[PDB]
Amino acid sequence: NEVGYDDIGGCRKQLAQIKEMVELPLRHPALFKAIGVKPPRGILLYGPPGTGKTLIARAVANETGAFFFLINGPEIMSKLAGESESNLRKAFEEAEKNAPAIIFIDELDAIAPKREKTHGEVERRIVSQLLTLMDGLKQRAHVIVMAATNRPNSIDPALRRFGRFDREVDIGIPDATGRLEILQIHTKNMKLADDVDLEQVANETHGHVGADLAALCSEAALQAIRKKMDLIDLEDETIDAEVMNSLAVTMDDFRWALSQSNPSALRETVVEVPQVTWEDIGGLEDVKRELQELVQYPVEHPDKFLKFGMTPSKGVLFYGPPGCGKTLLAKAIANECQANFISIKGPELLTMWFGESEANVREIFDKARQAAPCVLFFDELDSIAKARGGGAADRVINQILTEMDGMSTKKNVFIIGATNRPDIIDPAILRPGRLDQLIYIPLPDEKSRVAILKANLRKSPVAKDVDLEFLAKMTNGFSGADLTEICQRACKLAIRESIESEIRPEIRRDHFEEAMRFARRSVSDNDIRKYEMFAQTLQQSRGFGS
Amino acid sequence: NRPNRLIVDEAINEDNSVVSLSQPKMDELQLFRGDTVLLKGKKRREAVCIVLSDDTCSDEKIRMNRVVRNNLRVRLGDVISIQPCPDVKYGKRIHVLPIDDTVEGITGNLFEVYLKPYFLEAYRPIRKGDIFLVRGGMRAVEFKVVETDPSPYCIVAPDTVIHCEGEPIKREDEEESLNEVGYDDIGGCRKQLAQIKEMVELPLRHPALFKAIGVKPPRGILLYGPPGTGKTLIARAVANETGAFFFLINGPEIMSKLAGESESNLRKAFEEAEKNAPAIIFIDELDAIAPKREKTHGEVERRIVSQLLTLMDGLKQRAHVIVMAATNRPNSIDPALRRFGRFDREVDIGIPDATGRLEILQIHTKNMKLADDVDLEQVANETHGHVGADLAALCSEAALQAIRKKMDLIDLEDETIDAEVMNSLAVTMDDFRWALSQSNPSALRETVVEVPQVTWEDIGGLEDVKRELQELVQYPVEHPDKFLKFGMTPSKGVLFYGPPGCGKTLLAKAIANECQANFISIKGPELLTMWFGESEANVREIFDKARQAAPCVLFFDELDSIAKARGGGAADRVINQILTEMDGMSTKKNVFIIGATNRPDIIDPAILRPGRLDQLIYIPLPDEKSRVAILKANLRKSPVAKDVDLEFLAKMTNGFSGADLTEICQRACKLAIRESIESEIRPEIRRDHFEEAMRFARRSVSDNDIRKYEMFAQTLQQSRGFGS
Amino acid sequence: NEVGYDDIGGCRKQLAQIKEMVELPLRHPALFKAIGVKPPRGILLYGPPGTGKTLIARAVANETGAFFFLINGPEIMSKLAGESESNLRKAFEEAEKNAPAIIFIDELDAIAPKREKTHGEVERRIVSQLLTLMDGLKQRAHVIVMAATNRPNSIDPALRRFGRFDREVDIGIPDATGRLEILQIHTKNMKLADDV
Ligand SMILES: Nc1ncnc2c1ncn2[C@@H]1O[C@H](COP(=O)(O)OP(=O)(O)OP(O)(O)=S)[C@@H](O)[C@H]1O
Ligand SMILES: Nc1ncnc2c1ncn2[C@@H]1O[C@H](COP(=O)(O)OP(=O)(O)OP(O)(O)=S)[C@@H](O)[C@H]1O
Ligand SMILES: Nc1ncnc2c1ncn2[C@@H]1O[C@H](COP(=O)(O)OP(=O)(O)OP(O)(O)=S)[C@@H](O)[C@H]1O
Ligand SMILES: Nc1ncnc2c1ncn2[C@@H]1O[C@H](COP(=O)(O)OP(=O)(O)OP(O)(O)=S)[C@@H](O)[C@H]1O
Ligand SMILES: Nc1ncnc2c1ncn2[C@@H]1O[C@H](COP(=O)(O)OP(=O)(O)OP(O)(O)=S)[C@@H](O)[C@H]1O
Ligand SMILES: [Cl-]
Ligand SMILES: [Cl-]
Ligand SMILES: [Mg+2]
Ligand SMILES: [Mg+2]
Ligand SMILES: [Mg+2]
Ligand SMILES: [Mg+2]
Ligand SMILES: [Mg+2]
């Protein structure tokens, strides 16, 4: 019942890194003192609450068999002035006594926040006390200190110095795959109904963290118990096992718990591999190739680039009319390259307080490094352009530019930007060394339009009578988003008829013809002319605009 | 599990001697409406009652009042055996004695005021040892049946004599008080009180059961809402109804003590709760102990918050203890407390709606004799922005008024008390009207979250639009299965746009009413009011409340005001944050976002992007036919003369908006009123009034405006590219 | 020479409201203990300086004949830490002893200002101390607490909560008619010339 690596999911890579750092010196200590090389001593685990930081720490302790001394932030800070410092001192002394050992400082920020965030002489003294203890690890009795914090920015930067917490591990939020992994962990002991499909639950539970999932499963069990105990009327103090085994957890028990769920990390920026593939995108074939050359080749074939002696471009800029697949392409190329993906929409950047915005932009680029290979996507840039001509929009973009330059190409981080408005984009972004690969993405031509319709209607039951090639021929000038809306509007008609009169659930030709009568174009002819013009002259915007 | 065994449940019939079953179960046991049934509970106690039918009652459960519950030494969820009692015959003499703490203030004939009307024409079946409650004279006294001539039980027929002679008996140790708080003292928040009951009933009622399963129970529940909404009330109720030990921790009280004492008292509270588990620790005014870390400057203060956090973590012992806490400001609490393992469950006990306020008013008029002219529904409707405590106070105030004017007589009797007269005290509707004028409502500034009372009937024309709204909002709620088969996810939000005063706000509320779904309105100006720095947490708080109230329709009205304010660094941050919140809003949550603007020419294109407010619904001036419908709607409540022709009125007002017509009705109504005053007549609104009002009538939407609105109706989706 | 309602002018309506709130529980206490309905506990008088807030309190005490225990904000806050908290305790303890009684807290904002304006650990303890005492009035010992402050916004909002100072009375600036009434009060003992 004790915690182990088998109780942890959704962060394989991170859990691996920690194993490397800790396993050798903790399992083979005598070997390390003879080796003479200095190992890690301070490991900082960080991530939103409930990601399993405390869980991981304890797991590593049990699995390595090292002595585990836990230091809970709040408990330390609940003691008298001198007492907090003293308790810290003992913790380290006790660990050295029982080396090899792991000291785990939970909720580190409770003890050592930013120097400016501290109010009180006594508080500042405790931080220093901790800093000194970390330096005292020069004793090399070899105790490893792990620490957990929700917010890396809250921690006193002095702690991130060499000799202290010089190693960091980002235990971010789990992706679809991870959440599924976790769900399996907390459904180990429960009799699961056959209709249950955890993969759906995993996909559905976006913004969910480990603790949330553990709870969602817990609540799903209570639903099955409540409704099934009502009847049993057992009241017994001790319960019979045979009844518990006959107790199954239906897919409804999960859907009910799903609606009642308060996901915590929904506001958090997600870092995962997109589930969007080339197949979800119609047309733009030649662009997909160019994206593989720009993103995949430098990852899969670094040796080749070295022989020709060129450094590959850092970033790309998608530009064209709205609703043509710019967002789709960004996610798609990441999927092909099995590379992490981080989306940052314009509005997301303009939400940050003026002052706070600066540290957040850095944190984004930091996460991009952590997740290398990674494609960092700045979407909806047009929102930011409009907001400048705003001192906030200025500070953000100017810092993004600074970050781009600091980004070494060898880090395998690819930056893509997207905008529907190349006329108001900051020329600075288009400078060689930044987003200098200008890819124009126009309205879909006839052949392309057919592909889009095919993709969107895959999930839906379409009648055989429906001619999609003819639909494509009549919708010249319509964007990709326009076509999806026609399908949706046509589907609303098919659904409407299905409700009133229980009829074969399929969408037929007549629905599309009706949807077409009210269909409207999102991109006028005048817009096209302009987009076509910028397609040949966007690179000329760095001088005197026309 | 023989049929006689049944589960205890809440009561609907306020009558003490009444228990209810479902017809199918009443037939199963072979009992009927008139029958007198014998109830056997725990602790070898019994109670006798009249049985009744209840269509809502589930066959596995039995509804019984809290009085009956206590006589059986039973609580909600327990099991009891019921068996028929034809052996009950009329009584000769009955002897009941009052309980000291409920009668020490009153003197006189307790039997004529309370027992008389209580048993009159009632033929109540009672039992020896039973405790019943009689409310009257602004007081509730409980008597205990000491003896009955046909013991141990008999019916109280007119021939039965009563003797209530004797100093009130003292309270037995095991006899819990009915003056104590219970679920029946709470109204206006059924849904919330249900959620809490689910969370708490299992671990508190069946502790051994939870320890065997190994699944984690709740430990920290945080109740929040404005002051006086009944947060402290709910905590006490849940404790009593579950029979758990209740230890109250008052924030201010702890923070009034020395450093060492505060730390100490918190410890003892937890130690005491664990000692008497199962138990509920209630931390009242939590923000007093643990406010936002930035505002907690001071060493002694920082230590106590940490002290509490540690104690909360110490609950890992799993000593059947639940920690409930209340705070007016959820944002004020140190976020460390909202983390998992501590207060990981939250319940928003907001302000009561009309229906709720009525429920509450009924609670505090239990013991008062209400005159016939009293109409609590009016008072409820009238007391908008009132909170539980406000309503509770005004009822006390309306009563105190009835006493003042009736005190003329009492004074000469002051020496002693006039119990017989206390019953003669009625509370007129005037006493409420007086208290209404003197009321200081607290939650007027609070954002209201309730079901709108605006229906399709209040909206003229726009028939096809109403249709499209049902498809967008209702279908995905009522028919989720269908959407899954077609493999389409329904749109997230809508945008109303058109000339001013055509029913954009009305439609938003109407669709909410049709779906009986909660509704939250936030007008542009409201968003521009929030302090600049504060704006960030407030926008989020809105969407949080929308999630809490799912299914819910979130309506951003008067968007044009914000547009004008941007082209304003404040207006920018807000809308950009709303866009962010929209995206984070999962369509599967059944939260529908609607926006409205009179100015599609300056609306932020970002709002119109697919995935946000991508359903662009145009709402034009009403055509001839619609104008007639609107005119009827406004004049429904008013006394109109037969001569007034609305078909012609509509014909003359081509180009007028919905609001314009309403203004015409008002102006025409004002003329009729004027004439009623000058010349004393019952007013009627006739042709002459409309003609006079029409001569001065003016149109709010010009021809130039119409041309423009019609153009945007065809090109609003094109604004995401280059401007026109 | 002691103060009475006849020494007060320019606020008929307000003085009437206070009389209503106070008359029942203070004059006929036994009835209120028996009836079970809740009387007012905290009445907060507010208005610019010198409007007669302190005057009204004294008058209401005399006309009702209740025991009057005055708590001066500045006086309590001028004492050492322990004495300040202790003096508050004493005030409530004696008032409960001599019920019916009126505790008048003059210059309330001196003791309990907005939490944000309350720099200092010891100062907040006193505010909490007061809040508890007000809650301790749950004894329903025929005791009413009246308080005066120049700035209603300055008072800790916790005090305006139900069960504490749940009733407020605005004693604004007197109008022309009011000012005349006042003038007559302070010219009672003077021989006034005819030209006046
Ligand atoms: N990756 C995970 N795998 C399995 N269970 C998890 C995982 N993450 C969280 N949980 C569950 O959530 C519970 C609490 O997680 P924690 O270990 O407390 O993470 P945490 O980040 O330390 O929480 P905070 O920040 O102190 S609120 C665990 O006991 C698990 O049941
Ligand atoms: N080439 C395409 N293939 C399939 N679907 C498309 C395509 N282009 C656009 N869409 C649809 O339009 C939606 C959004 O398109 P995006 O990928 O976001 O391109 P975009 O340039 O960012 O357009 P906007 O401004 O976000 S609407 C997708 O969800 C698709 O349904
Ligand atoms: N929902 C309700 N139903 C019935 N009575 C209520 C309700 N809410 C409040 N009351 C009454 O008003 C009084 C105030 O209730 P409280 O328990 O004090 O609520 P509260 O939120 O804890 O007050 P605060 O926050 O401490 S000011 C109670 O004594 C009730 O009599
Ligand atoms: N279709 C209608 N049916 C009945 N009354 C209407 C109608 N349209 C407008 N009104 C009247 O106009 C008032 C406000 O209408 P709204 O619902 O606010 O429409 P709107 O589009 O939001 O225009 P404004 O800017 O708020 S006046 C209502 O109080 C009605 O009296
Ligand atoms: N309404 C009034 N009627 C008669 N005399 C008044 C009135 N108002 C003020 N006065 C006189 O002016 C003096 C004002 O003193 P106070 O009663 O203390 O007023 P106050 O508002 O409490 O003063 P502050 O705010 O503490 S400086 C009184 O002593 C009276 O003599
Ligand atoms: Cl830009
Ligand atoms: Cl806008
Ligand atoms: Mg933790
Ligand atoms: Mg996009
Ligand atoms: Mg309370
Ligand atoms: Mg409106
Ligand atoms: Mg004064």
From Swiss-Prot, chain C:
Post-translational modification summary for this protein: Phosphorylated by tyrosine kinases in response to T-cell antigen receptor activation. Phosphorylated in mitotic cells.
GO cellular component: ATPase complex; azurophil granule lumen; ciliary basal body; cytoplasm; cytoplasmic stress granule; cytosol; Derlin-1 retrotranslocation complex; endoplasmic reticulum
A GO BP annotation: positive regulation of protein K63-linked deubiquitination
Residues that bear N6,N6,N6-trimethyllysine: 117
Keywords, comma-separated and alphabetical: Acetylation, Amyotrophic lateral sclerosis, ATP-binding, Autophagy, Charcot-Marie-Tooth disease, Cytoplasm, Disease variant, DNA damage, DNA repair, Endoplasmic reticulum, Hydrolase, Isopeptide bond, Lipid-binding, Methylation, Neurodegeneration, Neuropathy, Nucleotide-binding, Nucleus, Phosphoprotein, Transport, Ubl conjugation, Ubl conjugation pathway
Effect on the protein upon substituting residue 107 to Q: Defect in ubiquitin-dependent protein degradation by the proteasome
Gene Ontology molecular-function annotations: ADP binding; ATP binding; ATP hydrolysis activity; BAT3 complex binding; deubiquitinase activator activity; identical protein binding; K48-linked polyubiquitin modification-dependent protein binding; lipid binding
Subunit details: Homohexamer. Forms a ring-shaped particle of 12.5 nm diameter, that displays 6-fold radial symmetry. Part of a ternary complex containing STX5A, NSFL1C and VCP. NSFL1C forms a homotrimer that binds to one end of a VCP homohexamer. The complex binds to membranes enriched in phosphatidylethanolamine-containing lipids and promotes Golgi membrane fusion. Binds to a heterodimer of NPLOC4 and UFD1, binding to this heterodimer inhibits Golgi-membrane fusion. Interaction with VCIP135 leads to dissociation of the complex via ATP hydrolysis by VCP.
Annotated protein name in UniProt: Transitional endoplasmic reticulum ATPase
Shown residues within the full chain: 199 to 394 of 806
